[PDB]
Design a protein around this nucleic acid. Structure first.
Ligand SMILES: [Mg+2]
Ligand SMILES: [Mg+2]
Ligand SMILES: [Mg+2]
Ligand SMILES: [Mg+2]
Ligand SMILES: [Mg+2]
Ligand SMILES: [Mg+2]
Ligand SMILES: [Mg+2]
Ligand SMILES: [Mg+2]
Ligand SMILES: [Mg+2]
Lengths: 72, 134, 59, 194
RNA sequence: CUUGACUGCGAGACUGACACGUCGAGCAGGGAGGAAACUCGGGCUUAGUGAACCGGUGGUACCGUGUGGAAGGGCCAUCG
RNA sequence: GUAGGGGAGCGUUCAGUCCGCGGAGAAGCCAUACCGGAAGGAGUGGUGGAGCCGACUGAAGUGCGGAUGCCGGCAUGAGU
RNA sequence: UGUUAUGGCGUGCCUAUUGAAGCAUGAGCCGGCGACUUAGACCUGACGUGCGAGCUUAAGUUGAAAAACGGAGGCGGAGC
RNA sequence: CGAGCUGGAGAUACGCUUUGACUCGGGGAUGUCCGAAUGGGGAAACCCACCUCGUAAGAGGUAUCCGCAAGGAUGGGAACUCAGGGAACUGAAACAUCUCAGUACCUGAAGGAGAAGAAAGAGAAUUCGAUUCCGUUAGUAGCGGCGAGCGAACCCGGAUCAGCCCAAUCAAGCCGAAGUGGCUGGAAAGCUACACCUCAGAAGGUGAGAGUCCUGUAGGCGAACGAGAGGUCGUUGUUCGUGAAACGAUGACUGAAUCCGCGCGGACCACCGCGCAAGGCUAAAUACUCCCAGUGACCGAUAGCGCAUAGUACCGUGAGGG
């Protein structure tokens, strides 16, 4: 779980044989077709009192260049 | 009196009961009994293997108004788009178009969305006019 | 079923069925000249009876 | 050409349906009506699914002398039923012209015998049910027949309460069955009449 | 001597359950040989073959999503 | 005359209408030498102790010998 | 009508099959349970009714011992 | 309510009741132990403590989670609703994309309903104006090993219709009209001879078949208390399977304007036209049936729920079955 908004919660990932082409190949056709997940980065800073938690890279870039409801 | 009330003489037949019959064990003998898979279409029997593409569009479709209707009977009621509702040309959903079918002399003036060449010719030959919007 | 639409099962005024001629469509040609314009108009109705069952509503 | 109870004459209006009194149409209509009123409610656990049983049983081979999957099948006792009644409807739309033609033809089917129209339902004097018996008796109705009274005037119909003499169908709620089923039709109020 | 190994079409038949297949007078646009009648829309004939689908190439301009375009599609050839 | 198509019908339950029957006895059950082209239906007798034929129309959970089919009861093996 | 003696004739039923009295399947016996339905504004035919160059409504609204209202829409009406 | 009562109970004993019992409604009053269980432990209904109050008997407090405080939550609920997660047989007459289907299953949150909602929209008329729901458009437009198959939306007809804040009558109940004689019979409500009520003939009970014999019915009344942004990458949604793929949506990395400004109109550009995102709330039309009522061309004892009451007997270590 992150700082601001959302984390994890991911979707599937594919792969294609006869991949690429001359843009106007015969066709693309499919193989992979399986479900998958996503994670992100950890960091530690305090707000309102000394704390640690975890920090989204987006939230880290947010907190670094300014205090949006929090400090480092 | 409902007691005396009779049937339609041939509306209803009885249904088909396959219990009994004594020498009814229905359908086939073997082979393709019991299934819900029958399905009279399908893949490679002369449907595929058939060489068509074409191009699908199906655009604007006009309501056909026969001259043969307009001339001959009624009044020459001076149609416009108004009367068409009650004149038994009422369908809508589409614009209205006039074409020549029956050939007869009358004075008539019709307002439709479009019309054919020989229809124009036949409306003018017996005298009249056909209006179109810009 | 949605295949037979743009492809020709096409129905006529007499409730007959238009397929025509397949003789060679695109691949495999380079033989004669009237086979090529031999792309036709023609059909039998023996297999029309169950044909348009696929085209039934949007004939 | 029918005569009212109190006051003027009329019924020279309303040509009665042709051909005269066709019983087929009548049949179609009433049947349609009882099918309309028919209320589908069906208790069947038809499906092997609907009654309750745990589903794996004993064994497919080697037990000897049976071969069953479940205790809930139609060929068992206590299981589901093969093709049992479910809550259907059977209410449809009868073509309107045949409804009209129907009750018209009904009224007409009363032309080969007794029917009655009326004005002045004031002869009841409240209800009292007795003054209805009087009205009937002096109008020729001894209630040895079955009578369908059609009228407005709540007081006038409220006078007639019994399954013996009569039955009441108000404010032109006329029903082809309801008339053809009763012996005499008393049309009373000339509103939907003429 | 030459490009009928043509384009536009097909009266009427052979053959197949179907889809394929076969033969063909004659009409046109235009041709080639002969002086001429005329003959030729591949080879004395019967084998030398692949339905559909998805794409590659040339041509035509029909569709083309508010409209004028363009993308993509469609049609006539053809390629795997 | 087998699968298969066609026609007429018999019976059972519910339903509306009509005619009705029943403690001087209903349905059901039991016996029967009658009727009907068949599915079937009457007559009288014997049980029974509350209800029920017939006609007309309508609707079906509507007709069993088999499915090593389901439940139940009772046989065989055997006084072994 | 019941039973019987003798004569003549006489290869259970079902399924499955080229072919069954079969030494091929099934089944101890009787009772009861027990299998070609139902649904959709689907499609296509036969018959029947109502209107008919026109024919219908759907949701819903209002009455509801009752049915009326509801033209949004659907099908004819022109083919290529 | 006004003579009975002392539960199913068949049963003896003791009694209670017009100083209105019983029964029916309506609030309070007590409520052992367990269980979210919550002083502490625990193989649920048990074993051990502490701090106050004090005359013991006996009452009271002692879980964690939000908070100044008041206060709120932890649990439970048949189906219904939203969400996090997400099958396979099966179909394609084999099988990978597809189909099954976001179905089943698990999980989270909540109410009597939920969800959804107040245009950076639908859409091609310079039309429409929150949402949901039904009919319809329409098996159309479309998606697809262009196979099996999948399948919209706008218009239009209805149900119901609100936009507001903000950031610089129905329940106890009571009242109720009108028949006698003879007859068959064990017994009558049936037959019969005469008669009556009916804003009451709906119904059940009564020795058999019932308007007028009982309860009722039509009609009438009725209470203290009680209710009613953009991009790239990986991807995905909707008819959208990478297709020319727009747009919404995000996991990662990037992260512009702001009023001659900004997103959209299915690659893309101009024109033209609709529209103001990055903040919240928001009845009604809708779904379901644990429960109650009324009905039925629904069953009537192998039917109907499994049960004419039983999750009992019974089977299993158990989930479970029955
Ligand atoms: Mg067989
Ligand atoms: Mg065979
Ligand atoms: Mg020639
Ligand atoms: Mg393919
Ligand atoms: Mg048999
Ligand atoms: Mg022995
Ligand atoms: Mg021995
Ligand atoms: Mg598989
Ligand atoms: Mg398969």
């Amino acid at each position: 779980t992150g700082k601001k908004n959302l984390v994890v919660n991911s979707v599937i990932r594919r792969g294609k044989a006869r991949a690429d082409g001359g843009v106007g190949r015969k066709t693309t056709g499919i193989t992979k077709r399986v479900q998958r997940a996503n994670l992100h980065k950890k960091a530690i800073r305090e707000n309102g009192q000394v704390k640690t938690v975890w920090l989204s890279a987006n939230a880290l870039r947010t907190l670094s260049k300014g205090p949006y409801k929090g400090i480092e | 009196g409902s007691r005396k009330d009779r049937k339609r003489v041939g509306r209803g037949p009885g249904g088909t009961d396959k219990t009994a019959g004594r020498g009814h064990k229905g359908q086939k003998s073997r082979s393709g009994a019991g299934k819900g898979a029958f399905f009279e279409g399908g893949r490679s029997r002369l449907i595929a293997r058939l060489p068509k593409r074409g191009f699908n569009n199906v655009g604007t479709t006009y309501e056909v108004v026969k001259l043969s209707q307009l001339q001959d009977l009624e009044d020459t009621t001076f149609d416009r788009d108004t009367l068409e509702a009650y004149r038994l040309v009422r369908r809508k959903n589409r614009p209205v178009k006039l074409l020549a079918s029956g050939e007869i002399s009358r004075a008539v003036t019709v307002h439709v969305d479009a019309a054919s060449a020989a229809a124009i010719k036949a409306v003018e030959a017996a005298g009249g006019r056909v209006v179109l919007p810009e | 079923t949605h295949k037979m639409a743009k492809r020709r099962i096409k129905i006529t005024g007499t409730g007959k069925v238009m397929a025509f001629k397949s003789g060679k469509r695109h691949q495999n040609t380079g033989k004669s000249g009237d086979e090529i314009r031999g792309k036709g108009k023609g059909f039998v109705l023996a297999k029309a009876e169950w044909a348009r069952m696929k085209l039934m509503l949007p004939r | 050409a029918q005569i009212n109870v109190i006051g003027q004459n009329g019924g020279r209006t309303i040509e009665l349906p042709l051909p005269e009194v066709n019983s087929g149409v009548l049949h179609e209509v009433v049947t349609w009506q009882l099918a309309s009123r028919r209320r589908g409610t069906a208790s069947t656990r038809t499906r092997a699914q609907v009654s309750k049983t745990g589903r794996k049983m004993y064994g497919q081979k080697g037990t000897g002398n049976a071969r069953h999957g479940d205790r809930s099948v139609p060929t068992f006792v206590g299981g589901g039923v093969a093709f049992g009644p479910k809550p259907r409807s059977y209410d449809y739309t009868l073509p309107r012209q045949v409804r009209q033609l129907g009750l018209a033809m009904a009224i007409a089917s009363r032309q080969e015998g007794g029917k009655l129209v009326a004005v002045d339902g004031f002869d009841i004097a409240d209800a009292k049910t007795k003054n209805f018996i009087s009205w009937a008796k002096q109008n020729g109705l001894d209630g040895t027949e079955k009578v369908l009274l059609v009228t407005d005037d709540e007081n006038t119909r409220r006078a007639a309460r019994n399954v013996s003499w009569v039955s009441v169908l108000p404010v032109a709620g006329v029903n082809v069955y309801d008339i053809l089923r009763h012996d005499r039709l008393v049309i009373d109020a000339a509103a939907l009449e003429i």
